[PDB]
Symmetry: C2
Subunit: 668 residues, 2 copies
């Protein structure tokens, strides 16, 4: 409990960003001379963050580009100000011996050229040096200088290595805070070249905000929120921070642009990674968002990361787009349709290859996203897996320096999640152990599977994988119980021929569900209808699965005790229409599992193609958080259907390997 409050106070205090200080950008800001050093606290930061091998940068992850480039950039500060020559050469040793990332081949050449303007014994004569110094010109050539001055671009992030540019038409391109694409390095060098006080103002605040020392990117108010939400959400503890999450999710909605989302509010250049993350979470949490904001990253069928700079697209952004395409609504622009296909192909061509590199388990995160589309993504399934995939402090981010995200790439995030999940597994085992008794002492295993522990186990598991909450135990057990009766009864009819020869008064049977003073009567009425559905759908070809599901949501709605006001006309329609979809969607599923007869891949792929279709209009009506039906009622429909889909799209082998991994393979 203390931990939840820990994450809460961290989220309530959300802001510009929790980022690690970058050694390179801090010393490059140290290089700015008094307006009459200008930030002696940049230097005061520098002296202390020296690693024992005499080097700099990220300590916990050793990277060549990072330890070298961060180390020397601190050196070019200490010696060019002729102070602390003790550590200055002590780290000059590190550079010499280990001489054998973003903007690396642009900021490093201007940093050696800057190393020449001082004296510093460093192997410039490196065979590795010529290969990346050649790419200096291999890129400064494909960049059109007259285009770098016309529209804000990703290049403006590396102006320390840029030579002889028109600042008259460049200051027109900065971010809203005055920064040059949010690099303090690019703004320091832009200030050495022009004294724009709004371009200074970005810099001083960044050092004031950190009491010395400055990161490699700022601010990142959007990226951080979006990703902190997705992370808490996947970890299953999102329910604890509902006001805080909906607090900053609002912020993302406020700053939605028709051109997409950037990593910060005040960056005019947008990227697909942030837009897809934003689009998914905004739609997932019930906001009105239009996916057409994506066609800004489509150029002739292909999907890049920036609007124009057709760079090679990385792996993580395509994952995040693929996920956003999974919340496809039928009324949406086709761009989301095209996006799904492209991103699936991108990640499939790469799945069978270790070319999944960009974080702890990025292939596992991706296998899931591809093997379990939305219709079959049960939140506890994803969450159990995600505990074994979330990197914690292990995740590192590739910027100008190696940097880390304090707020959402946290170790407290895991300790909290694995706690809340263990208590779920504990509450789950006691839950079913109580269920097993209930099943047996009812002469109820005589009906059902030829191994009723298996028909019980999956029937309880589905309900708990979806309605997993602490207190919602009333509903969960109700779902499991009613499910078992329905399975039992369907089994009895299947090997007897129908209610035609129902010798018994099997209406009763609900009295196997314990009497609640508010629950029992209405549950009798719903169960009566499921029976009445059998005798009518009996001597025909329509399946009953549609009505089995419809009964379920009816009970789950009786437990948990919310009713649908029926005087209001649109309240009636939205409910009555949700039932139609669930009745229709589960009936089509039961037709696919019959064609798996077992022949015609062409025919099965037709049924799948249209179930996905009807699922979209359901997913729309369930998430559309303005609809006149209670969000919990809407979730109840989504829960039942997803579980039905889950079952219909999964081998019994895969299904209980999940059961073992979520309920029994204890975390912590």
């Amino acid at each position: 409990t203390t931990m939840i409050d820990g994450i809460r106070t961290a989220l309530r205090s959300i802001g510009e960003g929790e980022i690690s200080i970058s050694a390179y950008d801090t010393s490059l800001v140290a290089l700015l001379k008094r307006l009459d050093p200008q930030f002696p606290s940049t230097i005061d930061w520098i002296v202390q963050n020296q690693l024992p091998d005499g080097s700099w940068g990220d300590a916990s992850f050793f990277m060549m580009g990072d330890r070298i480039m961060s180390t020397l950039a601190c050196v070019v500060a200490l010696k060019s100000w002729n102070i602390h020559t003790d550590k200055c050469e002590r780290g000059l040793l590190f550079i010499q011996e280990n001489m054998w990332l973003v903007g690396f081949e642009i900021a490093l050449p201007s940093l050696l050229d800057m190393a020449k303007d001082l004296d510093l014994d460093i192997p410039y004569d490196e065979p590795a040096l010529k290969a990346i110094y050649a790419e200096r010109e291999r890129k400064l050539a494909k960049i059109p200088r007259d285009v770098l001055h016309s529209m804000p671009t990703t290049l403006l992030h590396s102006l320390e290595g840029m030579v002889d540019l028109d600042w008259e038409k460049l200051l027109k391109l900065r971010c809203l805070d005055g920064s040059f694409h949010c690099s303090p390095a690019s703004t320091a060098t832009a200030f050495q070249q022009t004294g724009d006080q709004k371009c200074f103002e970005y810099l001083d605040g960044i050092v004031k905000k950190f009491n010395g020392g400055v990161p490699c990117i700022y601010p990142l108010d959007v990226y951080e929120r979006l990703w902190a939400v997705d992370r808490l959400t996947r970890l299953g503890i999102s329910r604890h921070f509902t006001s805080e999450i909906e607090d900053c999710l609002d912020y993302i909605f406020r700053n939605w642009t028709p051109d997409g989302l950037a990593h910060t509010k005040n960056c005019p250049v947008k990227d697909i990674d942030d837009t897809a993350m934003g689009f998914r979470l905004l739609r997932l949490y019930g906001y009105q968002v239009d996916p057409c904001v994506l066609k800004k990253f489509e150029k002739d069928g292909k999907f890049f990361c920036l609007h124009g700079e057709s760079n090679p697209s990385s792996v993580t952004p395509m994952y995040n787009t693929y996920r956003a395409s999974q919340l496809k609504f039928p009324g949406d622009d086709g761009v989301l349709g095209r996006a799904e296909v492209f991103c699936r192909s991108f990640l499939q061509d790469r799945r069978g290859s270790n070319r999944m590199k960009d974080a702890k388990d990025i292939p596992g995160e991706v296998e899931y996203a591809m093997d379990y589309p939305w219709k079959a993504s049960l939140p506890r399934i994803e969450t159990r897996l995600y505990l074994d995939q979330y990197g914690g402090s292990g995740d590192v981010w590739i910027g100008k320096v190696l940097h880390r995200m304090t707020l959402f790439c946290n170790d407290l995030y895991l300790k909290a999640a694995k706690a809340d999940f263990s208590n779920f597994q504990k509450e789950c085992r006691v839950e079913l152990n109580g269920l097993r008794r209930w099943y047996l002492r009812s002469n109820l295993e005589k009906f059902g599977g030829t191994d009723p522990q298996t028909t019980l186990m999956t029937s309880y598991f589905l309900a708990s994988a979806n309605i997993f909450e602490a207190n919602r135990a009333a509903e969960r057990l109700g779902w499991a119980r009613v499910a078992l009766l329905a399975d039992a009864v369907s089994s009895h009819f299947r090997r007897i021929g129908g209610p035609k020869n129902s010798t018994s008064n099997l209406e009763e049977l609900i009295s196997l569900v314990p009497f609640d003073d508010a629950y029992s009567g209405s549950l009798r009425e719903a169960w009566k209808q499921w029976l009445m559905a059998w005798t009518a759908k009996e001597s025909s070809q329509e399946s009953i699965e549609g009505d089995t599901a419809i009964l379920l949501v009816r009970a789950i709605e009786i437990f948990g005790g919310r009713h649908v006001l029926t005087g209001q006309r649109p309240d009636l329609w939205e409910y009555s229409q949700l039932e139609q979809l669930t009745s229709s969607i589960c009936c089509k599923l039961s037709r696919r599992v019959l064609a798996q007869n077992g022949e015609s891949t062409e025919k099965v792929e037709e049924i799948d193609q249209q179930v996905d279709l009807e699922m979209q209009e359901l997913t729309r009506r369930v998430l559309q958080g303005c609809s006149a039906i209670n969000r919990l009622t809407r979730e109840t429909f989504l829960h039942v259907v997803k579980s039905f889909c889950y079952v219909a799209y999964c081998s019994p082998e895969t299904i209980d390997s999940h059961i073992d991994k979520v309920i029994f393979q204890d975390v912590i």
Copy 2:
């Protein structure tokens, strides 16, 4: 409409010392003393010169003559003075007034049918001056009147037994300023003029409540009534109640009314206050007429098993007084004179508490309440404007009509419900009366507008029980049950609240058949439990879990109702097989016992079980009792007269 209710309501809210009519006689005795009483006497004097619409021989004279010994003795407006002096000079010739043979011959003295008026010689002087007595009410015509020890006998108001008449002459003989204080107050309080007795704060209250309750409209004034019923509890004395708080001499008429109503509204009251009025096995009025014995008798019906025996003797005695007078026109009252005096008594004497249904009692009473017609016998004819009202009847006959109208509509809902549900296939041969009778019992008790859920649910649920029970008789028992009978309750309309526990209660009632079969015990006990359980589901009342004696007191109410109804369904069975009235009435007294203990637990107005829950127990059983103690011919007379004989 409701307009009358608010009118009657504010009348109760502004209750106080009393709203009474002025007596001309007591008003004139202030002529002997002066200041506006004569200003009133002249102003109001009737066209033939002289009470009012009830002309009575005994006192039309002094209503008039005291106007003269006032007018001529101060000699003003002698024009009207003789305009009635002609009237008296001509009409000079068991229905008599109080203090007459002492207050009239002394009224003669200031100036042949009268020649008869020796009675003031049966009075003991030594007791008249030692302890207060009712003689202090009429002291104006007395010789040998030693005042030193009489002021020791006055009321707290300063009055002599609360009569201004005995108080004026007591002032000519002593200028006592605390006795003036009473007289001064009374004439200020009526802005001229004075009644023949004052104040009446207790009597007026006790009686205004009794009237609104019997008229069935008490429910409208629950806050209004318990406001002035509190006043009675506050002024309860261990020696009884007088007609005012500040009268040290107590009477049974007030004490019985106070005791009955107080215990009735759940106040804790002890009946031993009566034995102050038992004198050698007999029950006089002071420490006897008919109307007070009635008011006693009813008070005696609220006997709890723990009470002083004085209620035991009270019931037995007063029954004898009203029977020996039953077939006789000796139902005349010497205190008052009233519209339907035997009807009030006939009922109260034929139907005890166990069978006293509120809607029946209310219906009969609407035709018995005299309104302005009733007049009360004191020194003069006087009336109670507030409590002997004509508006009381107009309003009461009103919402009772609203009840008959609302009853008739539900009946059609029940008939349709009954017919379209195939339940007439059994339930005797003539279910149209099996229906009517069952709806009546529910409506005779739970008659409110807004309690309609319960009323219909009761009747519906009872109807099923008759249906199954008759069917069980016709086939030989639950031994051989051919059918699925749990499913009949789905014939009751399906509420999301009711119909789940309503099934459970019904399932349980059936189980009583299969366990109480193979036995001799009857099932009426469980049918009665079955009803009340249903009525509680419809009314949506639960028992607070945790408080232990709530559970206990509930479980005991079920015990008592089960016992009473089992015992009940044997008096009506052994009196089928005519087993001698002495043998059957051995059970009849033994039912009276458990009924008391139930009536205790219902009116024990403080246990943590809801008042409505307890009333539900009284309601079901009272209705079970009614059937057992009523000829079926009588019951149809009630139903026709309660629902179908439209008032107004």
